[PDB]
Amino acid sequence: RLVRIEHTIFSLPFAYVGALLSRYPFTLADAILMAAAVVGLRMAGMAYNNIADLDIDRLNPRTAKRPLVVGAVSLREAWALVAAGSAIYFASAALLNTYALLLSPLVLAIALTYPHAKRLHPLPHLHLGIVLGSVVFGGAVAASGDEASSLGEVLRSVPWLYVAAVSLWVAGFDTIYSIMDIDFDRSHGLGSIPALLGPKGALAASLAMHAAAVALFIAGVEAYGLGAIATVSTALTALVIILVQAMAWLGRVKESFNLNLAVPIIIGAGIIVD
Numbered sequence: 508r509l510v511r512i513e514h515t516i517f518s519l520p521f522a523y524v525g526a527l528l529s530r531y532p533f534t535l536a537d538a539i540l541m542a543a544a545v546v547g548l549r550m551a552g553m554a555y556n557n558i559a560d561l562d563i564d565r566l567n568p569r570t571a572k573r574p575l576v577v578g579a580v581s582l583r584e585a586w587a588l589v590a591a592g593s594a595i596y597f598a599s600a601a602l603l604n605t606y607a608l609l610l611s612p613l614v615l616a617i618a619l620t621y622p623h624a625k626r627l628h629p630l631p632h633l634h635l636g637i638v639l640g641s642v643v644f645g646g647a648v649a650a651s652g653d654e655a656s657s658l659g660e661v662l663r664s665v666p667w668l669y670v671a672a673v674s675l676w677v678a679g680f681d682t683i684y685s686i687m688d689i690d691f692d693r694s695h696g697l698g699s700i701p702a703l704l705g706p707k708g709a710l711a712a713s714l715a716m717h718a719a720a721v722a723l724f725i726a727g728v729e730a731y732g733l734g735a736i737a738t739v740s741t742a743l744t745a746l747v748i749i750l751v752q753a754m755a756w757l758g759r760v761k762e763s764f765n766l767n768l769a770v771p772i773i774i775g776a777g778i779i780v781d
């Protein structure tokens with residue numbers, strides 16, 4: 508109704524890719540706990556999304572059919588989903604390691620601060636980038652099995668290239684997605700990149716993002732061993748990132764969005780067949 512937990516299947520492989528590239532061993536239990544942490548964080552984030560930007564999502568033509576606006580769900584059920592998400596996440600983090608639990612409020616803070624980034628500065632896309640960066644970071648810090656000796660080790664355990672890359676990718680295709688909202692997001696005090704500079708300039712900034720995104724995905728191939736079955740995943744990904752940029756400049760922006768759904772499936776099946 509308000510939060511479809513099925514969608515989380517697309518956000519999972521970014522956690523596992525952060526866990527594997529840390530090169531620390533983890534158990535099946537650890538993996539299940541990772542998944543749980545992810546569905547919790549998704550639940551909290553998605554619920555509090557509809558909560559925070561509600562007053563300005565009722566005014567929007569585009570989102571007048573959203574739940575919590577029409578009705579369907581109450582504010583109570585939504586807040587309940589927030590508390591439940593935070594709770595599941597905290598539970599997973601605690602069940603995992605001491606460092607995972609230690610960093611869990613910070614990670615949750617990031618995911619819950621994003622919907623307020625609009626009213627502050629015209630870079631919410633970067634914030635989403637940090638958000639889907641925190642699931643990679645979380646996977647890494649949870650990969651250890653607390654095999655780590657100190658916090659100075661878990662922060663060195665994180666595949667920083669890939670989090671800083673998936674971040675820029677997300678920021679990119681969100682910067683693209685926010686073009687249809689250029690009009691609405693400037694009528695009100697809302698902020699975004701395609702509102703600051705025109706839709707053309709937005710695509711330009713989007714180009715700069717996805718460029719640096721592909722740049723890092725490639726740099727990781729050398730920085731790590733990454734075998735030869737993940738180097739086709741890097742290629743297939745970098746390829747897809749191009750089409751979503753291609754379809755964008757061609758005006759067909761709606762198709763430029765759904766193509767971003769491929770790369771999780773790409774690297775997801777890439778994590779499978781080890």
Ligand SMILES: CC(C)=CCC/C(C)=C/CSP(=O)(O)OP(=O)(O)O
Pocket residue numbers: 518556560564635638639
């Ligand atoms: C962060 C992850 C799980 C991937 C992004 C998934 C996705 C469809 C996000 C776009 S929703 P968002 O643009 O933040 O919110 P609205 O503008 O639609 O109100």
Ligand SMILES: [Mg+2]
Pocket residue numbers: 560563564567570
């Ligand atoms: Mg909105």
Ligand SMILES: [Mg+2]
Pocket residue numbers: 684685688
């Ligand atoms: Mg938006």
